[PDB]
């Protein structure tokens, strides 16, 4: 194991889609749940896989405050997404913050969070660590329009077979 | 040696985003910084890397639970300092 600078050290963000996981908004939701008592946690990584399905979620409670947490300034959308699913609407009251049922992170622009922030395009995935020098990085690393889909959620009791955001309905 | 009759949770294909140009005012903007890079599953590297990513998320969550930083954790120096301390 050879390390020369800190620049040789790469944190790659891999997606759940690339590991044969169904990332429709109805199948992704059920991997997410709210809870109280655990705080957000963020981490930086250096590059990321171009994801297939990303999410831009803006669901609010019948009061009006947005369920998810207002992102810090350094939170930007996922750079390379092929499809973005705008989930938007009105959902019954729910306390706490939405985390992952798998232990995976919500990948942002070079930031991985344990919770999703309102107004920001994220993908689901994980972080790997690999160490490589320039001679080998030159051979291991060889040197876009998004499709927007729109969904809404309806306020009321969720069914037992449903994501945290409830049943989602695609619209125009 | 490696055959897709073996892998079942890995897509073997992987593309990633990674004169006066170094000056902030003259460099790329925040949506023009990333170059597309292609990574081949030459020695089953792509599926090892998906596997690594999937495996690291227990160490990573545990570590992020250890810490009280509520802004953004920096992992690079962490990895380095433990490299230098392992020897």
């Amino acid at each position: 194991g050879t390390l020369q600078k800190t620049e040789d050290v790469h944190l790659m963000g891999f997606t759940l889609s690339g590991q044969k996981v169904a990332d429709s908004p109805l199948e992704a939701s059920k991997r997410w749940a709210f809870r109280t008592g655990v705080p957000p946690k963020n981490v930086e990584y250096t590059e990321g896989e171009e994801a297939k399905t990303c999410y831009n979620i803006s669901v609010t409670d019948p009061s009006g405050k947005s369920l998810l947490l207002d992102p810090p300034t350094n939170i930007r959308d996922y750079p390379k997404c092929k499809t973005i699913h705008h989930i938007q609407g009105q959902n019954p009251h729910a306390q706490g913050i939405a985390l992952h049922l798998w232990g995976a992170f919500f990948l942002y622009d070079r930031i991985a969070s344990t919770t999703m922030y309102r107004g920001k395009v994220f993908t689901e995935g994980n972080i790997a660590a690999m160490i490589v020098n320039k001679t080998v990085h030159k051979m291991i690393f060889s040197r876009l329009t998004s499709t927007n889909k729109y969904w809404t959620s309806s306020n009321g009791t969720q069914t037992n077979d449903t994501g945290c955001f409830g049943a989602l309905q695609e619209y125009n | 040696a490696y055959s897709g009759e073996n892998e079942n949770d890995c897509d073997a294909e992987l593309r990633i985003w990674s004169g006066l140009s170094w000056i902030p005012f003259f460099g790329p903007g925040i949506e023009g910084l990333y170059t597309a890079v292609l990574i081949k599953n030459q020695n089953n590297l792509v599926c090892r890397l998906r596997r690594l990513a999937n495996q690291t998320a227990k160490s990573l969550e545990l570590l992020l639970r250890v810490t009280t930083e509520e802004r953004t954790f920096s992992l690079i120096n962490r990895i380095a300092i433990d490299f230098l301390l392992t020897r």
Partner: antibody, heavy 119, light 107 residues
Framework: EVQLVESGGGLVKPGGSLRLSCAAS????????MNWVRQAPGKGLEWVSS????????YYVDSVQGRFTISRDNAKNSLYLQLNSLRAEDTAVYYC?????????????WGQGTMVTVS | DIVMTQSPSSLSASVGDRVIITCRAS??????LNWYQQKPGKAPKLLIY???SLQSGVPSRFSGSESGTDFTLTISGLQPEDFATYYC?????????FGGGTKVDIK
């Protein structure tokens, strides 16, 4: 025995749709990247599309970009190619080809092919 | 798009002859080149891959070598069944591209 079988090709009027199928056998279809290559009468081979196992990398040859749509259903071990706004230059025999992602992404399993005529 | 230039477009040869077919890339594609052999009315068959490796079930008359962007197909001893149209295909980035071909006739 690993085999790919093409069907769903016929005679179509210039300016309408035609849907091709493929049905894998013998190998794990969900683990491999699938391609479509056509050969126009008396011309050479021509790669047209590829879809990756997880369906996350999708590629087309710009002659057909926006016109054709590739997809797959991994449970059915089936590969599909929807051909839209068909042209006089789209007359070609189409194969479904498996790309082996662990032997340097080589196209090794071809089908017998199906003929698509746009007259 | 990566371009592929196969040479010549046609070649005349006899049985037992040595045949040299060349293949040139616009950019550098490493060793991600394959060679095919197609007969009229038949699906193309994979002979060389990784620019030099031999596909199971292919005789050892066919052989591939790489020198930068330049690649070579080589059939040192021709059988009466080795008259067919060959192509090189780059398997590196997409769109994947095939050469023009090479028609090997009887001399």
């Amino acid at each position: 025995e690993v085999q790919l079988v093409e069907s769903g090709g016929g005679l179509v009027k210039p300016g309408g749709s035609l849907r091709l199928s493929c049905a894998a056998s013998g190998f794990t279809f969900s683990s491999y990247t699938m391609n479509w290559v056509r050969q126009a009468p008396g011309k050479g081979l021509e790669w047209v599309s590829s879809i990756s196992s997880s369906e996350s990398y999708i590629y087309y040859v710009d002659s057909v970009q926006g016109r054709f749509t590739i997809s797959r259903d991994n449970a059915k071990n089936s590969l599909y190619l929807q051909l839209n706004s068909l042209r006089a230059e789209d007359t070609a025999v189409y194969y479904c080809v498996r790309r082996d992602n662990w032997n340097y992404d080589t196209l090794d399993i071809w089908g017998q092919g199906t003929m698509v005529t746009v007259s | 798009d990566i371009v592929m230039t196969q040479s010549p477009s046609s070649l005349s040869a006899s049985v037992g002859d040595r045949v040299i077919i060349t293949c040139r890339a616009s950019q550098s594609i490493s060793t991600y080149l394959n060679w095919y052999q197609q007969k009229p009315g038949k699906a193309p068959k994979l002979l060389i891959y990784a620019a030099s490796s031999l596909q199971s079930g292919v005789p050892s008359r066919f052989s591939g070598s790489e020198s930068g962007t330049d690649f070579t197909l080589t059939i040192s001893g021709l059988q009466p069944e080795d008259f067919a149209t060959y192509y090189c295909l780059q398997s590196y980035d997409a769109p994947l591209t095939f050469g023009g071909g090479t028609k090997v006739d009887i001399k």
